[PDB]
Design a protein around this ligand. Structure first.
Ligand SMILES: [Zn+2]
Ligand SMILES: [Zn+2]
Ligand SMILES: [Zn+2]
Ligand SMILES: [Zn+2]
Ligand SMILES: [Zn+2]
Ligand SMILES: [Zn+2]
Length: 595
C-alpha cells in the first residue's frame, strides 16, 4: 500500500535537521546572501592582485567559504525535494539555490583563466608560498593548464566551437533513441515481443534462447541499416576531439583527456595490452557458461543468460547481512555503517508517493552522508545498500580527515569503494552459503559484472584508442573501417570462444557518443583497484586493510594514481591488475567445480 510523504514515520526517514532545523532557517540562511548587479562584490577581479600570494590566499579563502555555504544549502534543498518530487515548495527552494550556484559560477568565472595565465615565475612563487601551502594541490591542478592554454582570443574561439560541435552527439541521440524504428523479437512459442532499449536489456537476460537471439539480431539490423550515418557522426565527434587536442598543444587526444588527472598514457596503454593477453580468462568463463547451458556454440547473445534460478529481507535483516558480510573491513567500519543505517539517520529507507527513484549517496562537507533508498526487500536491494554504503563511508572518511577543498575524491576514484563493497558482500555470502543453486547464482552475478565492467570496457577502450589514432593520422573513419577495427577487436577478446553473427561487428554503432573522450577505461581501473584492495584484505596481506582505510580518508588530496600509490596500489606497474586477475581466477575455479 502506497503512502504520501507526510504519513511516513520519521524513524524510516533520514534526519536532515543537523543541516537546518527546518525550512525557515534554510530560507533564513539562503537570505543572508541578498540576491541582487553583482551579488558578491568581494569576488570581483578588480579586488585582487594575483601577483601577491596573500591576496590569492584571501581569494581562495573567501570563495571556498561561500561555496561551502552554497553546497550546504543545495544539499538541504535537493534532499528535501527528493522526498516528494512534486511538492511545490520543494521545487522552488531547489530552483533558488540552483540559481544562486549559477550566479556564483558567473561571478567567479574570471578566476580560472586569470590564474592559468600568470607567468611561470609567478606560478612557481605561488606553489612555493607557505600561506598557500594548504592549497598547493588545488592550485597545482589549475596551474598545470597554463602550458595548454593560449592567448585569451585563441581560447575565446575554442570555447566558442563547443556549441556547433554538439551536433554530432545530438543527431546520434535522435536517431538512436527516437527515430530509427525498432523491430521485433520472438520467443520459442512464437509470441513476438516488440523492442526498445530497455526491453533489449531485459531480453539479454532471458531464459528463452530464441528471444535472446532474435532480440540481439534485430538490434544489429537496426544499426546496420544506418551504418554510414553513424560512421559520419562518429567520425565527426572524433574529429572534434582532434580539433581540440591539437590546438591546445597536446600530442594526441588521449593525452588531452588524461592530463587533468595526470595519467601517463602508458597506464591506459598497458591496461589494454595486459587485458588482451588475459583474453583466455574470457575463454575460460564463457565455456563454463556454454557447458552449463548445454549449447553447441556460444553467441554474444548467450553472454548474459542465467545458469540457475529468491529470499526476502527486512531492512533489519539487510543490515545484519551487511554487518557480517563486510566484517573483513573491520569492527570500526562495520559499526559506523551500522550506526548510520539504524540510529544516526543517514538513510531514507522506503518508497513513498513521488519520492525520487532508485538510490544514491549525497551530503556535503558539513553533513553526515545521506543515503536515499527505495528499499523493497530483495537481494538486489541488499547490495544497493552495500554499494551506497561504500560511497557513503568513502565520503564520511574523507570529510572527517580532509580540508574542504581537498575532500571530494575525483570521479576516477568514485566507483572503488562501492564496487569493493558489492564484491565483498558476494564473497562473504558464498563462504556462508550451503545451497549450491545459490552459489551458482552468486558466482554468476559476480563474474558477469566483472566481465562486463572490466573486459568489455577495455575492449571499448582500445577501440576508442585506435580510432582516435587513425583520425590523428588523417585516416577517415568509414563504416568499412570502423567495422573492421571493431571486428578484429572482438576477435582478440572473444575469438577463442564466441561464434560471431553476421552483424556482430556493428556494435560500435550502438554505443552512445557520451561514452567518448576516454572515460570508459576508468570503469576498468576502478574495478581493478577494488578487486586488488579486496584480494589483499581477504588474504591479510601486510596491512592492506589499513591501506584501504587510508585510501578512503584521502579524499582528493592528490592526483588519483598518487593517492593509490600511497595506499599500496601502483597502477604504474602490473601488480594491481595481477591481484585483480587472481581474484577472478579463484572465482572461475570455484564455479567450475560446482558443475
Ligand atoms: Zn516474454
Ligand atoms: Zn550458433
Ligand atoms: Zn584517522
Ligand atoms: Zn555508485
Ligand atoms: Zn601512428
Ligand atoms: Zn558501405
Amino acid at each position: 500500500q502506497v503512502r504520501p510523504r507526510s504519513e511516513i514515520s520519521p524513524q524510516d526517514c533520514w534526519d536532515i535537521t543537523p543541516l537546518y532545523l527546518n525550512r525557515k532557517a534554510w530560507k533564513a540562511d539562503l537570505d543572508s546572501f541578498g540576491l541582487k548587479s553583482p551579488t558578491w562584490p568581494a569576488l570581483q577581479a578588480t579586488q585582487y592582485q594575483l601577483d601577491n600570494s596573500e591576496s590569492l590566499l584571501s581569494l581562495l579563502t573567501t570563495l571556498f567559504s561561500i561555496e561551502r555555504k552554497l553546497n550546504k544549502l543545495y544539499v538541504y534543498a535537493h534532499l528535501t525535494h527528493d522526498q516528494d518530487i512534486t511538492n511545490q515548495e520543494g521545487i522552488a527552494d531547489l530552483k533558488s539555490i540552483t540559481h544562486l550556484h549559477t550566479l556564483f559560477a558567473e561571478e567567479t568565472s574570471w578566476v580560472q583563466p586569470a590564474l592559468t595565465s600568470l607567468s611561470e615565475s609567478l606560478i612557481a612563487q605561488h606553489l612555493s608560498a607557505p600561506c598557500l601551502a594548504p592549497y598547493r594541490f588545488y592550485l597545482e591542478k589549475i596551474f598545470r593548464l597554463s602550458i595548454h592554454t593560449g592567448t585569451p582570443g585563441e581560447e575565446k574561439i575554442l570555447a566558442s566551437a563547443f556549441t556547433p560541435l554538439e551536433v554530432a552527439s545530438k543527431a546520434f541521440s535522435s536517431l538512436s533513441d527516437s527515430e530509427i524504428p525498432f523491430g521485433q523479437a520472438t520467443d520459442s512459442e512464437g509470441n513476438s515481443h516488440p523492442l526498445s532499449h530497455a526491453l533489449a536489456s531485459l531480453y539479454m537476460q532471458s531464459t528463452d534462447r530464441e528471444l535472446r537471439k532474435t532480440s540481439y539480431l534485430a538490434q544489429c539490423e537496426r544499426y546496420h541499416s544506418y551504418r554510414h550515418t553513424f560512421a559520419n557522426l562518429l567520425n565527426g565527434k572524433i574529429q572534434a576531439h582532434v580539433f581540440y587536442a591539437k590546438n591546445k598543444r597536446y600530442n594526441s587526444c588521449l593525452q588531452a583527456a588524461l592530463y587533468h588527472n595526470n595519467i601517463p598514457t602508458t597506464v591506459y596503454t598497458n591496461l589494454i595490452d595486459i587485458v588482451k593477453k588475459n583474453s583466455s580468462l574470457i575463454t575460460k568463463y564463457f565455456s563454463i557458461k556454454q557447458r552449463c547451458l548445454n549449447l553447441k556454440d556460444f553467441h554474444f547473445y548467450d553472454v548474459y543468460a542465467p545458469l540457475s534460478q529468491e529470499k526476502k529481507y527486512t531492512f533489519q535483516e539487510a543490515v545484519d547481512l551487511i554487518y557480517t558480510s563486510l566484517s573483513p573491513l573491520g569492527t570500526e567500519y562495520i559499526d559506523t555503517l551500522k550506526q548510520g543505517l539504524t540510529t544516526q539517520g543517514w538513510v531514507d529507507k522506503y518508497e513513498n508517493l513521488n519520492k525520487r527513484s532508485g538510490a544514491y549517496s549525497s551530503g556535503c562537507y558539513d553533513s553526515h552522508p545521506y543515503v536515499l533508498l527505495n528499499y523493497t526487500g530483495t537481494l538486489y536491494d541488499v547490495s544497493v545498500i552495500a554499494h551506497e554504503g561504500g560511497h557513503s563511508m568513502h565520503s564520511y572518511f574523507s570529510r572527517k580527515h580532509q580540508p574542504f577543498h581537498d575532500a571530494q575524491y575525483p570521479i576516477f576514484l568514485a566507483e572503488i569503494a562501492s564496487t569493493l563493497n558489492e564484491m565483498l558482500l558476494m564473497d562473504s555470502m558464498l563462504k556462508e552459503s550451503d545451497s549450491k543453486e545459490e552459489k551458482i547464482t552468486i558466482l554468476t552475478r559476480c563474474l558477469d559484472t566483472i566481465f562486463s565492467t572490466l573486459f568489455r570496457q577495455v575492449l571499448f577502450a582500445s577501440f576508442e584508442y585506435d580510432i582516435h589514432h587513425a583520425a590523428e593520422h588523417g585516416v577517415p573513419l568509414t563504416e568499412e573501417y570502423l567495422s573492421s577495427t571493431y571486428k578484429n577487436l572482438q576477435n582478440e577478446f572473444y575469438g577463442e570462444i564466441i561464434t560471431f553473427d553476421v552483424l556482430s561487428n556493428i556494435e560500435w554503432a550502438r554505443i552512445p557518443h557520451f561514452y567518448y573522450n576516454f572515460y570508459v577505461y576508468q570503469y576498468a581501473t576502478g574495478i581493478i583497484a577494488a578487486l586488488c584492495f579486496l584480494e589483499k584484505i581477504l588474504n591479510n596481506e601486510d596491512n592492506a586493510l589499513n591501506s584501504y582505510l587510508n585510501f578512503l580518508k584521502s579524499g582528493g588530496s592528490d592526483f588519483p594514481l598518487e593517492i593509490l600509490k600511497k595506499s599500496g596500489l601502483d597502477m604504474g606497474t602490473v601488480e594491481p591488475i595481477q591481484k585483480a586477475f587472481c581474484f577472478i581466477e579463484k572465482k572461475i575455479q570455484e564455479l567450475s567445480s560446482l558443475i
